[PDB]
Design a binder for this molecule. Structure first.
Ligand SMILES: O=P(O)(O)O[C@@H]1[C@H](O)[C@H](O)[C@@H](OP(=O)(O)O)[C@H](OP(=O)(O)O)[C@H]1O
Ligand SMILES: O=P(O)(O)O[C@@H]1[C@H](O)[C@H](O)[C@@H](OP(=O)(O)O)[C@H](OP(=O)(O)O)[C@H]1O
Ligand SMILES: O=P(O)(O)O[C@@H]1[C@H](O)[C@H](O)[C@@H](OP(=O)(O)O)[C@H](OP(=O)(O)O)[C@H]1O
Lengths: 271, 271, 271
């Protein structure tokens, strides 16, 4: 980010900013959360009311991840809805405009399925991250008791060293210590392995979806060129338009290329 | 989509589905709109209450586009918020886990700025699409009057052909016809040109953002490999971890590569 | 269909639409089901009230197929009835008009027999499709019991593993499993074979009937040319008409050609 060498949140100029000026900001910027309900805050605050202390930190993230998933679902649904209106608007216009509108409308409506698949994979990653919390919360109580029965024996030794409970308390401490050692080792093992596996799974899906979206956008941009936007003075008639044999071929080729693409066919080559 | 050769919304198997089984669906699917308020429906329904008939179809799309923008903003904000919790969770863990968590946390927090830039460019595209509606709504009333003063002269000719208003009404019809012809030609010219320009502008931003996101995801996946997830039995100590000189270099290289990338350096090559 | 590349149900222009403008829509379009009775819905809803779950899906289609057959029968009956009125109307007119009306009336009345034969063949295809449902509904109960006596043994093993019923329950499971395996294999075999045979039988009849109808229509169109429609001013007498020797020959030739046609004499050659 730009904060890593500046005291202000303003963004330093980049290659894109040098080539083209930064886009103007939004006309309206309301100073509101935009959630529209108390459900988000209630769910965020109710997680730690009764849960164990050790697993609270990770358990808090699951709720906000679910909120992210819901917001992405709403975004995808609304973007899918917009394509229908864009398509129907083209009925009362020229034939070329109507045809281009319909084809680009299905092309842009394609996005919703990719968004839904990405949402499902995000849900699986969230499920694994949730699965970590179960082992953490199971580990905590075994550690608590061993610590408590240590203060117990310390206090009882302070009160009087002639009590016969010293040896049994010490042996209970030894057994609890062995169990806690085993639990503590496996906890680190499991958290490392699960974090690595889940996070690799989550990182593959996003790049796959991004590459598919980029391919769809490129195909749409290639298709848009066929409009033949030329100025005409009043009193003239533009020639009849015939581009169905090109538009249909473009749509079929785009669908086939999107379907054929596989994981090993990734065009992006990071440096 | 899969609807183009099937009667059911189910998706036909693809290369990705053949390689890996489809992800399991979400655990909960509530049968609700999810908007959380009547504002969306109210804004959608109030657009056509008083506006001209010709521009209503295009004016209806602006509101849903604004809703899409707001939902995307909420998604970006929540995803940005999640990274902070992910980062703070790593404090109470092993040193390697904490370091990897912090670095990948900033790497995944990077996404919000790209989302905001895409939102701004989307807003500019929406502004141009709005600008089309002004010319449409200005064109409509000029066309309405010429049609009305035609039924007027027709009715007055039917009533009695000896009235002296025939010639003045006919000439007013001629003048209104000339003005309507000019307006009708320019309307088509302007709508074609503006649609092409705005839609090219909108299609470039999405592919740029997708390529940047894919690069960030690839760099993060490359960074994640350094975890060295190996199983350890209880009673052993893992060697001290030293990977700061690699993690910091990876972060710096990723930031430099993201900054250096330009429009002409697009790796994606559509067929 | 036209939905396979468009978001709207509107039909894209075709060769026929390019050659001739699309026909105007019907004058009246009532927003009603048109069934005229609750019998259709009652029969559709009563099929699954008590039947087995596996065969319900296929059993639901038989009722709607019977409804299709009844509607086709009503259509054929009404079309047959219309020819009688068309023929009787020609009595009070010119001799040539009366003769042409009678001959084309029998030619168009011919259609009803072909429709009845197609209906009978449709009924046979429906009978075979019904015959599939019997085997499906016989297969289901054999599968249900094997599954149930599995949950039974699982629960009884959970309750106490020292019961002596484990071995007898397990052997009953084994025998039911073998029977279910045999039934499951034969079910797939039978459904595939019956579907293929019935659907070939159903597809042959429709093309035969369509070819016969096309031949009849072509012969009628050829016969209609003999009317000699020419304009006449008042005060003149048209020459006496003599075309019985041509009309009777045309009717006889049409009947002979329709009778002689066989399956191997199909003129249609799909690409
Ligand atoms: O049906 P409700 O009223 O919505 O409540 C759900 C229920 O408490 C589940 O046990 C819980 O799963 P977990 O115990 O695994 O957390 C889920 O949270 P989740 O969807 O975030 O998993 C809750 O939404
Ligand atoms: O300030 P408010 O109460 O929110 O009302 C705004 C105001 O009516 C603007 O004129 C209008 O811009 P337009 O006339 O150009 O539509 C805008 O719509 P918009 O944001 O969709 O442009 C509205 O949100
Ligand atoms: O005589 P009704 O009162 O009309 O009732 C008939 C009777 O129940 C038949 O057994 C049944 O054949 P199936 O058992 O084979 O279904 C037929 O359905 P069908 O004509 O669709 O075969 C029914 O119409």
């Amino acid at each position: 980010m730009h904060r890593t060498y500046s005291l202000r949140n303003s963004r330093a100029p980049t290659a894109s900013q040098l080539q083209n000026p930064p886009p103007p900001p939004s006309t309206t910027k309301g100073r509101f959360f935009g959630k529209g309900g108390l459900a988000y805050s209630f769910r965020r605050s109710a997680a730690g009311a009764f849960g164990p202390e050790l697993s609270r930190k990770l358990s808090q993230l699951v709720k906000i991840e679910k909120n992210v998933l819901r917001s992405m679902e709403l975004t995808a649904n609304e973007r899918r809805d917009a394509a229908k209106q864009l398509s129907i608007w083209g009925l009362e216009n020229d034939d070329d405009v109507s045809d281009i509108t319909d084809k680009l409308g299905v092309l842009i409506y394609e996005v919703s399925e990719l968004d839904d698949q990405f949402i499902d994979r995000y849900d699986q990653y969230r499920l694994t991250l949730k699965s970590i919390r179960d082992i953490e919360g199971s580990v905590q109580p075994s550690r608590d008791r061993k610590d408590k029965i240590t203060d117990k024996i310390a206090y009882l030794k302070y009160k009087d060293p002639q009590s016969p409970k010293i040896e049994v308390l010490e042996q209970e401490l030894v057994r609890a210590e062995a169990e806690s050692l085993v639990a503590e080792a496996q906890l680190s093992n499991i958290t490392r392995s699960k974090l690595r596996a889940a996070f690799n799974y989550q990182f593959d899906s996003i790049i796959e979806h991004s590459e598919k979206i980029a391919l769809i956008a490129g195909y749409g941009k290639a298709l848009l060129e066929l409009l033949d936007d030329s100025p005409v003075t009043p009193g003239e008639t533009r020639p009849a338009y015939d581009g169905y044999e090109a538009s249909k071929q473009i749509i079929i080729d785009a669908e086939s290329a999107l379907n054929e693409w596989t994981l090993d066919s990734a065009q992006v080559k990071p440096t």
